Design an enzyme around this catalytic site. Sequence first.
Site, PDB file in Angstrom:
ATOM      1  CE  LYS D 186       8.006  14.844  11.652  1.00 57.39           C
ATOM      2  NZ  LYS D 186       7.746  14.657  13.101  1.00 57.39           N
ATOM      3  CD  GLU D 262      -6.987  23.251  13.805  1.00 51.72           C
ATOM      4  OE1 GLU D 262      -6.378  22.613  12.913  1.00 51.72           O
ATOM      5  OE2 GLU D 262      -8.227  23.418  13.829  1.00 51.72           O
ATOM      6  CB  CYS D 296      -2.347  26.045  20.299  1.00 54.09           C
ATOM      7  SG  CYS D 296      -1.087  24.930  19.593  1.00 54.09           S
ATOM      8  CD  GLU D 393       1.941  29.847  20.731  1.00 55.73           C
ATOM      9  OE1 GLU D 393       2.517  29.371  19.724  1.00 55.73           O
ATOM     10  OE2 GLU D 393       0.749  29.615  21.006  1.00 55.73           O
TER      11      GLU D 393
END
Lengths: 494, 494, 494, 494
Positions: D186, D262, D296, D393
């Site tokens: 996806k 992750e 990330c 973040e």
Amino acid sequence: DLPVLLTDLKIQYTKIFINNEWHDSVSGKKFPVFNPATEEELCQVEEGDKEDVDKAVKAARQAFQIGSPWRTMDASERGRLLYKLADLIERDRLLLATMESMNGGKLYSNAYLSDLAGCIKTLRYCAGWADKIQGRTIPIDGNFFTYTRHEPIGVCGQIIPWNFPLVMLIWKIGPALSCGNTVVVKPAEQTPLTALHVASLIKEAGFPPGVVNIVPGYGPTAGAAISSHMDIDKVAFTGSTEVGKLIKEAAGKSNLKRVTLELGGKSPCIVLADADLDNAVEFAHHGVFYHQGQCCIAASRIFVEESIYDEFVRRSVERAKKYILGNPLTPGVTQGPQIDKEQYDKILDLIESGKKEGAKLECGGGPWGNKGYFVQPTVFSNVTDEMRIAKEEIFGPVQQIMKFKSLDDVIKRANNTFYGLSAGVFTKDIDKAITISSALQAGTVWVNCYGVVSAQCPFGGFKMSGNGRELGEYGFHEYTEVKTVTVKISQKNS
Amino acid sequence: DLPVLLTDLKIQYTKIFINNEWHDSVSGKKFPVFNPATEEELCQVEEGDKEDVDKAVKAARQAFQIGSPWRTMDASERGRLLYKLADLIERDRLLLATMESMNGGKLYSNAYLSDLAGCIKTLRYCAGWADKIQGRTIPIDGNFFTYTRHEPIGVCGQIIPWNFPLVMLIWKIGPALSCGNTVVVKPAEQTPLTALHVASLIKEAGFPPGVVNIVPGYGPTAGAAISSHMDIDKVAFTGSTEVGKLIKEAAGKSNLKRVTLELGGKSPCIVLADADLDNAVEFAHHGVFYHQGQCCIAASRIFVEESIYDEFVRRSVERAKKYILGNPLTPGVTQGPQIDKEQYDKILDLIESGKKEGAKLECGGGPWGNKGYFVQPTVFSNVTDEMRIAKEEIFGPVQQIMKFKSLDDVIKRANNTFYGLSAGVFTKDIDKAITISSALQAGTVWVNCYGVVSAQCPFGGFKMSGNGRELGEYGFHEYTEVKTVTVKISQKNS
Amino acid sequence: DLPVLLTDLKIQYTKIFINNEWHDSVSGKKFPVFNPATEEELCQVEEGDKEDVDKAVKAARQAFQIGSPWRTMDASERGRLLYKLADLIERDRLLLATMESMNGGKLYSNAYLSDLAGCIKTLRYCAGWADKIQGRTIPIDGNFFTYTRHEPIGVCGQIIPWNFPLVMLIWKIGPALSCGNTVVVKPAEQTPLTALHVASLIKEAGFPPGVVNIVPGYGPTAGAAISSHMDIDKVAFTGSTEVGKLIKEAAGKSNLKRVTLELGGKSPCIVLADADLDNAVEFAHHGVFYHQGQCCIAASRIFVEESIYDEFVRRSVERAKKYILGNPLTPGVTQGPQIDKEQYDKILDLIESGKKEGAKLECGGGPWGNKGYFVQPTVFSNVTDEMRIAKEEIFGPVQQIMKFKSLDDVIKRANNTFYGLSAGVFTKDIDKAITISSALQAGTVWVNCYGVVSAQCPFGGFKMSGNGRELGEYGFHEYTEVKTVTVKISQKNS
Amino acid sequence: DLPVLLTDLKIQYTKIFINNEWHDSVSGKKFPVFNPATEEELCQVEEGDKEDVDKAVKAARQAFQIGSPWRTMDASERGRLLYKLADLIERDRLLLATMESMNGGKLYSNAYLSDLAGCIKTLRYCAGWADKIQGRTIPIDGNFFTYTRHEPIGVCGQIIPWNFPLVMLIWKIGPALSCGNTVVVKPAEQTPLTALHVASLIKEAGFPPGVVNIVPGYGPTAGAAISSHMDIDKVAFTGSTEVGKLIKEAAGKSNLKRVTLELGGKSPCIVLADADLDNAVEFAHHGVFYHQGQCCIAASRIFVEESIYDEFVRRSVERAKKYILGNPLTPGVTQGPQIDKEQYDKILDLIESGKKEGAKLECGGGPWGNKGYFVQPTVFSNVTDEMRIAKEEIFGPVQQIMKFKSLDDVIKRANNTFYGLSAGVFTKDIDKAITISSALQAGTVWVNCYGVVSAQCPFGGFKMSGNGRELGEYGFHEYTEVKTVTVKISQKNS
Ligand SMILES: C[C@@H](Sc1nc2c(cnn2C)c(=O)n1-c1ccccc1)c1cccc(O)c1
Ligand SMILES: C[C@@H](Sc1nc2c(cnn2C)c(=O)n1-c1ccccc1)c1cccc(O)c1
Ligand SMILES: [Cl-]
Ligand SMILES: [Cl-]
Ligand SMILES: [Cl-]
Ligand SMILES: [Cl-]
Ligand SMILES: [Yb+3]
Ligand SMILES: [Yb+3]
Ligand SMILES: [Yb+3]
Ligand SMILES: [Yb+3]
């Protein structure tokens, strides 16, 4: 040879074990521990709750800090401590087997000769790995030196079941400690006692404080506190698939802690017409009836080719009729009780479904005795796949025997379950043995045997029978966390 | 599908290959290369001697120096070059198979479909390993960081046999180059040509100069210069056990260079009474007769249980009688010649010993044709263990069939040889298959098959059939040299 | 803490050890064993020759037969026996260290605290590997199930040196036995005694007979019989490069037995201007002078950058002047004798070459005492590369110190030797540490330390310093023989 | 060299990919895909929902059935298909980089030279592993032959993020396919397009139908259907930690499917006073600003020792002021837009918190342009640990620079986060480099560099930055399911 304890067993250790000292519960509450053979209370044990799990985790975290004795000692010395602990368990073999038999409803012969043998051997196996956990040096692209560290993960919460309390305690702590982790163990509420003796031995062996902390108590209280804790890095659990789903959910909800589960099964055996018939009968029999059926690997669906089905069912039934029920400490007794009321009820309920749904009751099918949670060893033949006894884990002495004529179809029937812990294949044909074992969706496939477990092999479930593997080389991976270190250099060379 | 070369083959590359350029011999001498099917000279090739081996080694040493392109390129790029070389060999598949067939006396069908398929696949396999050769990080005692580098060894001398020239060239250079070594290859005096074409392709692929150097010539001259060279780090050799002993001796005498040998065999098959009979016949047949018997793994002793012996011998003999001898380039031909006079003589001599020592000649047993080194396919039954044909490697189309009645004894007879390259076991019984294969002193044991070789498997000899292994993960170890690096640190942590 | 033996040492075991019993020599001849500190005879020991090696090999072969106790016992039990043997050596630590000190000329403090500590730890390390030696299952091309067995090789001949008799005995037998081999050990003629005590302990531990056989005697007689035996599968040797070449040659000549050698060195240290100076002085000092210089890894060429050279030489010389010579059993003594006359002469001869060829004698350079093979600790500065003391292994307490100004050139000088056992790099700079250690052609490279040896690390030589590796995971490979088993199946699945 | 597409890009593939054919959505609904640089719609793509995930899973399940082409093909052929797919992506490099740049808001130079280079190289890396995934043969206690199969797990659901759509697609499918799994992918709702082109190439390469199925759509609809599906064996996800917790929870609730995540980071760099200052500035700069901060691993906390802090902040700020904002397809442009409104808002919100909470704005701190989701490159100095910009973040071009004076304390500050994806250490000191990198609770630790990612290295998070590892040898473990097969035998031998 089967020696015994010369004087009667006294219970000594009943407290929470944190930083190598014995703690009363924060609340001050205690909970009873029972003998399942007599239904009589053996002792009271300190009831750990969330508040005590918190003390245990803080101690484990401190024992894991960079620069601590446990982080800085030689791997070989972690190994040494583990082999020392094995020597101590061997010293206390009589005591531990008796306590295991008495608290766990477990046949003494089996406790002494099998459970304790396996516990000692598995510890010694794990000790050997401690200074053989290695990372890699890696030929990365570009001008870099890259290596990996297979570090311990950190604080590992470990929830132990009641069916094999010493063995499962060692399956958990052995690899976890070999790899350098600290642990917070929550033994089963039914069977806290042997773990608490082991804690005394961990202290005796000289493990640094906080490396092993044992918190007895209930599942929904102490077990939930472990699974949802924000400073526990990993949880390992063995038990029901139901509770397994709650563990994995709560980890996701809290701190995304690593999770490994060993859950139930509905493990099938396929017995081909060419099989050694009484070998297949004997292994399939012990496969389902071992420790009162309270094995996650219970061979609880036995598919037998049509032409040998009747003979298999007959021979099986005569084997099931040979048991002697009673106190698992008395010699000559060959079947003890179930662990508690909850399990006892669940088994009898499922026995009744077999009757009502139309399985052929060959023997057993009711309770036994004035005291104890005893179920008669029960055999059902002509079982079909939508029966409750064919779908649900009984966890009791209840054998299901089915027939098949097509090998394609029986493999589909074997695989048509959400479970997948193990399976058995009985045949003399090389090709059948290899192709069938390859096609089964089961973590361990036994060929012409059943229930062969050893420290050198990885063990765990496909599908809803679990996540990850324990023991073997492969199992040690899940008690490490891999760090890649990539260093810039002027020029690399191969 | 079996396509062919549309115009006739011309020979182009006939020179010594050093630093990606074509060299005349130092002496200026050349030597003839023959077609074994016609005994006619195909071309002249530059005769490498000690003086040319010296140029090749100096170039390999320079290509191996710290800071060179080959030492400093990414491992992944070594991989890339090897996969590129495979693509080029695939492009030149028709040319190479034809040249292989013509120079090697090898059936074209087999050359094209098997030798070249295996050569390409094995290169691609080795390419995949290049950036997956890894060392370790090790939890040493004390306050140290320890890691290992699995470095290339350096300059590897590689002496290739004549029976499978392209395949054996790739078995040698593929792993050696994947691991980062430089190589000095000495192809067989009989079959230098396909290696020299491969050299042209190594240049085309873009390998740095000096990474592969190919020096055609004779064994006692160029091969001895390699084995006794003071700056060659390792020698790899495939061939006779006799020459193997001279290699290993000369390495010891010179510079203690690393040595791996793949030598002859006298490989046994044990065929049990319960075996699939025609499967056992067909595999044992191809096991001994493949490529005119010129396989180190030749299934040259077939032990068959008494009750199926006669039927096995009969069926075998009828299979041996189906061959068509001739030029290996002509379609429909199913057996080519032996490689040369020396081998041809040795085979006929050993055929005569079978006759004189009293083996039962079932078919064959003499030469064939006006030209070419052709031996009729020969079958001996009632062979006994002290016969020359049962002890010595024939390396010819000569099958030996024995009888046995005791399994204990036949295993001793199978193992009673200084050889130990391979063996075959034919049975339907799981236990027999596992126990017999475990008991055989053979590097590869095939069960219900024979001659199944693939890149993913390690391959080599027990006993005087060799030292070390080629291919698989395990084979790559012998093209690395392990360096331990131990760094003092203030404090380690697990 | 340094405890001592409370009564004087008596020698008990002096016979050949075969099938767990004590044998007189076939000839009936005995040979003397001396104390190198007094030159006095300690005892007589049975002189093994070819005829006794033959008895030992036949016993090892029988202990290795398929179905024997040693082949059939659980790997875990091989492990258990090895850990038991370690416990026994620990029990006899005082006895063994004293005997080691007395027979070997080895400082008691070092014998007790280092040699015996390492011997016990290395055994325990090897014990851990026994049931962790594993083969593979391999996804071969085609419809086949392929697996490998990492079998023991078989009968391993093991020739032990005199410099570290107990440690080297355990480096040999530990891995060999862990992997399932049987062994014929030939301890050094100078130092048979501690090995013979270990044999008594092997019997006590319960090893099956014939698994370990110890044959004391001379090198050219018993050692040659081992190296040329037709039924010994592998030979392992530690000693001089000269004898190493004779071993490797004789193996090639006889039965192509597998060979691993750990030979001498001329190991270099490179000391950069930015190095921690007294750390570099202290490690380089102990690097060359440890055990009277009788270490294969002796740091026998110390290259120091020009700007710190004088200060390094000075500091080194003052460290060399602190020793106390004498009987290695007396406390406070810090340097014992050389092992024998042969070695003693060789060292003094090489000391004289340094003088005559023009090295600057900083201290020492002659003999010491009325008795014993004592050499004064000697330091030479301004050594140059063509001097005998810079090229030849002294194996004595003789330090060489050189200067350099160019890093490129000093690496070439470091690598410009046929040796390559080890090296040392002293610097604070990350890039220098990684690049220099990568560029050195040495099997172990120490960074900011020297002589750090542990069981978890592989150890061995590049170039003429050896073939293969001992200890670590990697070292265990060379005590296995890999068998590939390839089984035909109807259909494979991933 | 930076070539470009000679004619304008047309979009062709916009449908759901199942069984190698193009499917309209079950509902018939489509959803728009935008260019983040212009805010203009590029095309409409078929909106996959639960009903389409179901079709995709059924197809993946069928492609995984025992006996199917994908289960039965040689591992080497799985490898071949993957290398073929890499060749096709290389053929379409210009097309794919342009589409990636246009749909993803990604600088074309970077897309072409980095993303596509890494995508091709990582595929080729994974292809190499296919026929090198191996189990073990294990020396179990008792008379048994035990081996393991490292099987594919089965149907793997793989949810790809928008920041690196091609690279992350290949990180997912490469290992999954190499190991023999089937996949339901996806891709991100923002960036479906390059994945759909890759699907066309999977068909072209000749993958069996159902081996790769790609279902574009939204996260809460199609992504939830994947995470809660009862017949998906494993889910792999890269994205926010928030969504990671929902994935892991839903897996636990549904079928206990295996999970690897992750997730985000708040990755720290520690810059020591002795560091190469402009190397540290340049890497820390690119560490945080690469791809508009949408990594990330963003180096989003830079701790700099006090004495070099001012100089570091200054040099950093001047580097941040050099950017050119605009359409990522235009040459000379050095910063493109953020991906969408949601992210754009989140970044500006967090920029404002830095201002309000009292960080020193050095440059940037607002939006840019008439169209596109552009944020000025922003630098904050004097950041403190409880600020929002130090805890959350940002996933935007926003650099945080802190000061420290104590190394003990800065390590605690570095580790004082629930994140743990990566970290950077800048120093010249060997001991500091090793000890600091060991002490950081980060999955990748870069020393004197940052953002060095390669296929040969495992990559993943400690703590809430993820579960498991991708790539390297280690990452391939999590796309296998281990089966132990234990066969009863009459007698084992080592
Ligand atoms: C060409 C074969 S090797 C091969 N195939 C044979 C022999 C006898 N019968 N068959 C069918 C046979 O002897 N070999 C062979 C050749 C050289 C070294 C070892 C073995 C091959 C397959 C796969 C990879 C590869 O490199 C080579
Ligand atoms: C006794 C040491 S080995 C050792 N230690 C040394 C040498 C020079 N200085 N030091 C401190 C030294 O040369 N060795 C040594 C001995 C034999 C073979 C290779 C090396 C040891 C440690 C750990 C395990 C083990 O088996 C042996
Ligand atoms: Cl495994
Ligand atoms: Cl292997
Ligand atoms: Cl290693
Ligand atoms: Cl790793
Ligand atoms: Yb009751
Ligand atoms: Yb002729
Ligand atoms: Yb004297
Ligand atoms: Yb706007």
